[PDB]
Design a protein around this ligand. Sequence first.
Ligand SMILES: O=[N+]([O-])c1ccc(O[C@H]2O[C@H](CS(=O)(=O)O)[C@@H](O)[C@H](O)[C@H]2O)cc1
Ligand SMILES: [Cl-]
Length: 661
Amino acid sequence: MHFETTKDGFTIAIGNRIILSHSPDKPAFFAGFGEERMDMYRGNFDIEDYVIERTALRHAEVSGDSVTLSSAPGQAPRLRLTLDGNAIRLTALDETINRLWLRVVAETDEHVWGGGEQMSYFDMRGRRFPLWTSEPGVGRDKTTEITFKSDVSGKAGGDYYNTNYPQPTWLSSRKYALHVETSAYSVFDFRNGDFHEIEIWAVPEKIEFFAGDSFADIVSALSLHFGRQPELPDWVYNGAIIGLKDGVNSFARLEKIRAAGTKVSGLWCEDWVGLRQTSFGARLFWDWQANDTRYPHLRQKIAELADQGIRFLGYVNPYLCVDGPLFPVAESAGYFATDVDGKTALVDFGEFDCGVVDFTNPAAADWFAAAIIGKNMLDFGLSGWMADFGEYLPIDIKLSNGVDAKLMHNAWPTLWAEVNAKGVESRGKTGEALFFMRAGFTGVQAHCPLIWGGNQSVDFSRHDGLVTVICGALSSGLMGNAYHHSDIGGYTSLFGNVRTAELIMRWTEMAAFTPVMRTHEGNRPRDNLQIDQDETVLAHFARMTAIYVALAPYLKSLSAEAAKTGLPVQRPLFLHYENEPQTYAVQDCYLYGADMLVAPVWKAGETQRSLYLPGHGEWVHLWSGKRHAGGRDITVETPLGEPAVFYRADSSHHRLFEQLR
Ligand SMILES: O=[N+]([O-])c1ccc(O[C@H]2O[C@H](CS(=O)(=O)O)[C@@H](O)[C@H](O)[C@H]2O)cc1
Ligand SMILES: [Cl-]
């Protein structure tokens, strides 16, 4: 990167792209001090800053191979800037600073994407995005009654910016990416036309830059920096992972699903550990071993299923309930985070308390990986699991490494991902065992093989329904997570919001053109329609699983590309159609690899779908074989069973796509 003096200050560029511009009248950096409030209630945070100082660093001077910045001439410098390859390193010279703002040069028509897994807005331009892992919210839109009710009853509605997986990384339409190396609270402010502003509640070690001739090349570079995932295991291609939580009755319902012709790769029973009924619904018993009361012959059932070519998956998270038998084992070994007095810190998860396994203590992390992931899960015969949570570290607890919980909070999902990966690696099953996370932060990419979109409401809402999954996939894919999926039919049923047949079927239609089809009974299984309970829904589901299986050779080539190049399986239109600027904000269609275009129906009652077909070639409608020229809007019929999916006539996979007609 290139530092250049000007009349009154300096610029820093990557290539011909100016990134920072400083003068006394238009400073690049501001420094100061704040006292935050961050109140936690069941993984929801009410965050408010009290800024005591925000002071422009107007005065720059060269000092060896660095620049120092002070408030004004004749004042002691507060910040040092040092160029180091593709990074700007920052050193706090005034050790009182706990707030830093940095302005980066922006253009009027510029788009910015990333920010981790964003659930509402893909193109972040025009809005402000705090980056703090938490519950994403139920409803996530202060104008909906679901959100309002969630806020009033449990401070749980959230808003457009909340996510289980924030990351302080952006990709700019100017063909560079920026990454802030920090775990502190930070904010991306894209409200101004002429600059982007980053707020950090720390002076980060460095800010790193990635450039390239194409967006694809920059995503490759990012994925190499954060780490790539293994290829999907071959067993996944046998069909859907059926999610049931009905104890021994799960087996009979699976047989019913199978009798309809459904292609099944796995049975996922999150209640393998037992249930705990709460006011929220049928939650799980958070003690990570097979529960003989709920599944008295589970090991035998796993072997029966294996003989039928079906794997078995469970559930785990990084907390232990106080009333479970593992809790005193962990407490006795000193493996829990502590409170200010050195006692085990108890966290309320909603009508039950848990200890937090302290992964900053290497012995605790090793115990979790060896005893739970290794012995209780993999050695018990699980091929995979939901690896849940990560987003709830309160900021008033004490960690074994002595690092403030305010800094460890965002790091937690990555530490948790690493515990899972180490367990898997200790059994030689990297690339074969499949665990999936909803929570993330910088670095989760290297350890987690598959993301899921967390809890959507069981609806077609704009800010917590079906369509938000696509936003999540697109954003997280640019950040180097190649594989994304969602709960078919959503999760959260509260305040009378329950599934419909149509919702399930539309969600299944999308899921068949993603890496993994997986169902979930949700928080209130008997209040919500499940895939086995309606003949039409089940037959539609079976058919969609057959389509997914017929498409597996294509999906498998996309997984190979993901390993070779880092490119996500679900890509935004602009990644392959860079010279069509009007595509740059599209977030409800994706390219499934380079050769298929998918435009999910995300509203009730729709019989048709309108969308933009890009490029100058031909697109072939998957169900009819009708060809259409690229470069225009079209409207196609989308009855249930026939989502709006097209393939490139030029595709090397055309013979396969022709089969689906
Ligand atoms: O705050 N809550 O009450 C809360 C409840 C459920 C939550 O969902 C998470 O945890 C569920 C298990 S459990 O119900 O908390 O035991 C799983 O079935 C979901 O797939 C997962 O996303 C997450 C949070
Ligand atoms: Cl309710």
